[PDB]
Amino acid sequence: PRVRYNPYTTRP
């Protein structure tokens, strides 16, 4: 589940 901000993701 993603919706919140992240400057990068560990799994692209």
Added chain:
Amino acid sequence: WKPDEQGLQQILQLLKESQSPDTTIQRTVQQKLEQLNQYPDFNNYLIFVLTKLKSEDEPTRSLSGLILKNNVKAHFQNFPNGVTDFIKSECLNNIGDSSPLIRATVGILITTIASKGELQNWPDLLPKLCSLLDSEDYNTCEGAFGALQKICEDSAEILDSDVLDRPLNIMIPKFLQFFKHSSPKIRSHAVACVNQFIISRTQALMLHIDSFIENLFALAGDEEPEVRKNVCRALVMLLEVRMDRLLPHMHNIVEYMLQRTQDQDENVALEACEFWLTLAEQPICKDVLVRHLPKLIPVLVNGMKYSDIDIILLKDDDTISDWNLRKCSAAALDVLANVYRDELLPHILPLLKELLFHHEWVVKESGILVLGAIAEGCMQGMIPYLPELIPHLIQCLSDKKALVRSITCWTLSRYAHWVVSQPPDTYLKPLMTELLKRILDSNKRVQEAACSAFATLEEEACTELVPYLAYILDTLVFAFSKYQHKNLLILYDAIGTLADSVGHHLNKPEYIQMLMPPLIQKWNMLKDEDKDLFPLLECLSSVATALQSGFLPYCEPVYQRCVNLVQKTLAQAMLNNAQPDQYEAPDKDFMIVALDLLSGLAEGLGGNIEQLVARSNILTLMYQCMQDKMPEVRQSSFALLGDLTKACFQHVKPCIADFMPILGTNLNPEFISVCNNATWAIGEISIQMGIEMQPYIPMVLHQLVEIINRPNTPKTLLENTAITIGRLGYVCPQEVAPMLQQFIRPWCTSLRNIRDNEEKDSAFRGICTMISVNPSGVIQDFIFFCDAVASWINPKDDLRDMFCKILHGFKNQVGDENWRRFSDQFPLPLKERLAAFYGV
């Protein structure tokens, strides 16, 4: 072999006007163009213009061919045979024309044709291409390898499949040879082709593995970007598949990849940086990289600086690409942080001091980014420095540069846990204050970050937010009337979370008056067919649970629509499953969020929901949902069942005999969440059925017992498994007590790590009951029980007494000194709990 002079001039002139500056003649001529696609003779002209008409200019010829390509993307099922063969014939004979534009055009024709007709319909293609590979002329060999690249890129698993034979047996060794070709462009094609078979560990390549590594190694320092680029992709992919053949050369690879991470070519740099991510995942990494760290970190940390092009594209949906050197570098740091823990601090800290305060903001930004990136893996050794860094960051939330305020929100959110573990006035209060201001920042990207940060903080803060609710809701609801669309997703999230964190404390008329009007606004104005309902109903399922009986004013229309959504979805599925040609398939998400809202509705309302359930088809519907082929739908239906079982069992009881077969066949742990909610449901049911559960014990118990002893099983699944075994044991001690031996160990290990609550109470009444029935179940593992009993802070009196009778039972059974020898195992805080709370 038809040209036709009448039709020739008609298209030649219709190709002319399809190059006109204005759209008026363009779009009407494109309409009048591919509407001539009706004729079976049309596409023959197009190839003829491309390959056979030398008298026409190249732009026109090129275009004619590209239109023919677009006539294979769409309209290829309606292709005649002779046309197809003749186009195929003219392509392969011209694959390497002296004109690069014609060569490229013919190229993509071959690529599309051999893509749309998988590759049984051109069995002459591959052998003819490998033949044209040894061609004496360059242009032909270049053109062949170019099509062979695109084909390899499009149909890798199709070429490794049986569908066309296994032609990779001869193509793998063939490509490998051209690694030594004198042209850079050819070498590039060759490695790119081989690169497409690394991950799938294609057998044809695995016997050539060493000569593949050798050839690559000899190409590593090639001055042409594309080659360097392709070598880098290969070495990186090879880390996941053949790490055995890379270990002996490892230090040489890493040293090379560092030289490559700072490559003068952006693409190579990015592809190289991948290496650190992949490496970080292999269990070897932890000790093979320690020696390279004082050289790697600076390389990563310099890559985390905003590339100046990002600055302008940031400050339509204003966003950079999904994947950057910056992002990759940051990702690798985050993973290495998690691998080395505090052992990474000596390597990074000096750099932070230098960056965090630096006057140039682009540098400062990347510092804050670093601070957030190391946050998770480097937490314990970061804490000492936090009483200085947090107040600094809180100040940076007011920096004039938007992108600085951005990550500062994020970075603070990555230290939220520490912040709440402190007296709230000094760290939590001011953080909250500036974040609330920032949620209403003029910058879209800042709002996104601020709102997210606030959501993270809410999960961590919980009831420590209660006193500030008036202010929080004020700005959250205002944002509601302002936030665009992308930010609305995040805002809904922030509200649901608010509600989850403060629960019943949100149930005050002043808060309801603020929170509900705008949600009802959204509710009433969205249609049942609109996917904007998803985040709304999800939000409401949280708000309803928190509002409890404060939700009664709204409950019936809300209950009414959720049932409708579930019904219109199931119904749409059957009209699709019996008649696909007429009726479209439904989006099951409508059904999920409606089930979920129904859940939080039963939870907030308890017994007050019963009248809404009695006069509804919810159970009949739920029973269908529990059988859906989509796991997420089974997942939501079991949660609702658990809830109604709690809320109004009288309406569920008639269905138990029907429900239990379904629950029992859904204990597959491969579907984590389905299994979880099924297990929870079986538990709640068992409490309500009492002694009546007896028939179902043999149907579920051994599945639960297998699951609880199964390695690599998520902790919450283990938790509900433990709970349900406990609850089944509470009502059917005779049936469940004999397995005591087989579950007590992980049961205790699992349940010793959860907060005192009603479910924990429920489970321990069960373990106690089973103990008085089968004391020999625990004798061999009594230490696990003592440690689990001790994990309780404030047990109810009767439960506390039950614990006490059992402990004294065994002490007075085994003996006085016997207890001492057994108690010598206890860690200090355990030996001292049982003595203070229970009298040893």
